[PDB]
Design a protein around this ligand. Structure first.
Ligand SMILES: *C(=O)N1C[C@H](NOS(=O)(=O)O)CC[C@H]1C(N)=O
Ligand SMILES: *C(=O)N1C[C@H](NOS(=O)(=O)O)CC[C@H]1C(N)=O
Lengths: 242, 245
């Protein structure tokens, strides 16, 4: 079920980086990783938590649909794209923290905890602030647990409406062309060490789905582009993407 | 400039330079304003050909002929000219490779009575299903203009069509052509080859962060040499208008 393919380390080494890329071939029901230990190492999900947060908010009616406008609070933040009104699509695209913080507060501790349990999401521990537990609280999820979670989302098997799962998968749309479709979410766990970068999601091909979850050491924001770059090098090596 | 429809003849450069003739029709969803290089051709009704895969997919999902976007539609075993058709398909791939046999079967299952009722409810072009139940969109009575394609597409985009919200969401997912950090294109190509004038189609929309640009283009297609011009000329217009980089 889980093969260790150490050749992918070359992609990390060539990029002066370290981390794990985890791939899951849906058709074959087989997994591949350059590091089995790191693949099962649970980390703070950071912005990858916007996937279960969106799902819960949609199912509870906190988010009516992907067109609902979430007004900017007027607070100027470091990331320029957050300093405007957003809908679910753009909030996911620009990883708009205050929008997701508001969703989490509206969901509340009790429903957030019990609904995440329904998703079997990582350690299912929401300890810390309702609006920041995914960044500096007790929640932890491994790259293999991200895959397990994403596979349920792909198949509409999470215990939420099909509609909510379709809206999130639409909001996860990152890239598409004649060769593949990528539905994914980036993350950057900046608050608690080890500071890590995430990229979780999948690649849809005509006749298969390749699920992926990657994390890498991110001591600074300088290497953030490597989350997609390294994953893409692995996908290209495995002939998943041309 | 405050007008609902504006003609922009400068776009004709994109057709002429490519030794082509046609119409591109754009609709700025936010401003509720339309733009075209040819007002007359924008309203000229043609056979929808493969663009009919959008309403056909909608009807088939709503009626449960297509359970979901994963349902496998087996290859009948007949070898056809377009290689990609000679294999099993789901709604995503059938739309992607415009697999005619799959859609002919859908239409036959839907039947003429339900097909007619659905198109009238969709206000789809002239709503005329005359001809073969499995070919009317290629050689029958159905006619739709580029502007009527946009009207139909706007309702689909907003889940305003009479069929289920679910069928509309699945069809828009199946329409996914291209996506990146700047835009998302949800569209369907067409090539009306049976009844003159032989024409190429490209209908759909461009999703931006804060706007949607609906488009419908058709162009003369005397040879398959110009097929790539359907997307290329549209993209030249979208680039000229600063819609896409
Ligand atoms: C999410 O992890 N964060 C919000 C935002 N996301 O950008 S990212 O998806 O490319 O990682 C910035 C980083 C991080 C945060 N500072 O909370
Ligand atoms: C649809 O109009 N057709 C099926 C197929 N479509 O490819 S297209 O979307 O690029 O136009 C080939 C042409 C046409 C047909 N022969 O029926």
């Amino acid at each position: 079920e889980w093969q260790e393919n150490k050749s992918w380390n070359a992609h990390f080494t060539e990029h002066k980086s370290q981390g794990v890329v985890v791939l899951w071939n849906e058709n074959k029901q087989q997994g591949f990783t350059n590091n089995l230990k790191r693949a099962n190492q649970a980390f703070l999900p950071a912005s990858t938590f916007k996937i279960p947060n969106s799902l819960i908010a949609l199912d509870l009616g906190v988010v009516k649909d992907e067109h609902q406008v979430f007004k900017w609070d007027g607070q100027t933040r470091d990331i320029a794209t957050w300093n405007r009104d957003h809908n679910l699509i753009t909030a996911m695209k620009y990883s708009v923290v205050p929008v997701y913080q508001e969703f989490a507060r509206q969901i509340g501790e009790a429903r957030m905890s019990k609904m995440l349990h329904a998703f079997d999401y990582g350690n299912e521990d929401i300890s810390g602030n309702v609006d920041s537990f995914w960044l500096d609280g007790g929640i932890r999820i491994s790259a293999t647990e991200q895959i397990s979670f994403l596979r349920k989302l792909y198949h509409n098997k999470l215990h939420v409406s099909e509609r909510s799962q379709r809206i999130v998968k639409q909001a996860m749309l990152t890239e598409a062309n004649g060769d593949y479709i990528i539905r994914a979410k980036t993350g950057y766990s900046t608050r608690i060490e080890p500071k890590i970068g995430w990229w979780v999601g999948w690649v849809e091909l005509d006749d298969n789905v390749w699920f992926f979850a990657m994390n890498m050491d991110m001591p600074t924001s300088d290497g953030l582009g490597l989350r997609q770059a390294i994953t893409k090098e692995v996908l290209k090596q495995e002939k998943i993407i041309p």
